[PDB]
């Protein structure tokens, strides 16, 4: 495993928009063997989707309908990574 | 560290044929506290 060597960052984990695919990235396959587990919290629905990348990274994303402050928890091998949970509010339509 | 986790990849495929049927919760659950159990390298390729 290596919940420490876990990668975590993205323009969606900081915040996003209501009704707008919130993207992000969490890489940790190099850290070592281990299963991925995360808690996606939010006062609205949420459709997860794994999209590939040119570098082969792993940027997952999800859309939300409730405008306001939502939040997605984060866990590796079932281990809350430092600074958890990750607070992530939804801003208003880019405008 | 390169298989012990994958070994748990098939335990799930069966653990579902074990209890069969299915299970889920929502509606009466305002906060969508869902999760995502992704397995190393999902169906689609990457490396």
């Amino acid at each position: 495993g290596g919940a420490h060597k876990v990668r975590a960052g993205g323009p969606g984990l900081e915040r996003a928009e209501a009704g707008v695919p919130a993207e992000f990235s969490i890489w940790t396959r190099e850290a070592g063997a281990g299963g991925l587990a995360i808690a996606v919290e939010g006062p609205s629905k949420a459709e997860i989707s794994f999209e590939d990348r040119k570098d082969g990274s792993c940027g997952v994303a999800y859309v939300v309908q409730e405008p306001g402050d939502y939040e997605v928890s984060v866990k590796f091998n079932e281990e809350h990574i430092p600074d958890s949970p990750f607070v992530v509010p939804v801003a208003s339509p880019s405008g | 560290k390169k298989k012990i986790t994958i070994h748990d990849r098939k335990e799930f495929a069966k653990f579902e044929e074990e209890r069969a049927r299915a299970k889920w919760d929502t509606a009466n659950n305002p906060l969508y506290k869902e999760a995502t159990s992704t397995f190393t390298n999902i169906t689609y390729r990457g490396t």
């Binding site: 495993g1 063997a33 281990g34 299963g35 587990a37 808690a39 091998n77 079932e78 281990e79 | 012990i4 986790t5 748990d8 653990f15 299970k23 999760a35 159990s37």
Partner: peptide, 21 residues
């Protein structure tokens, strides 16, 4: 794996006595 594997199963359920130790 690690503590994960057994408590890893997200599905909140544990009727059998929790082994651990």
């Amino acid at each position: 794996w690690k503590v994960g594997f057994f408590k890893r199963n997200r599905p909140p359920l544990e009727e059998d006595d929790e082994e651990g130790e």
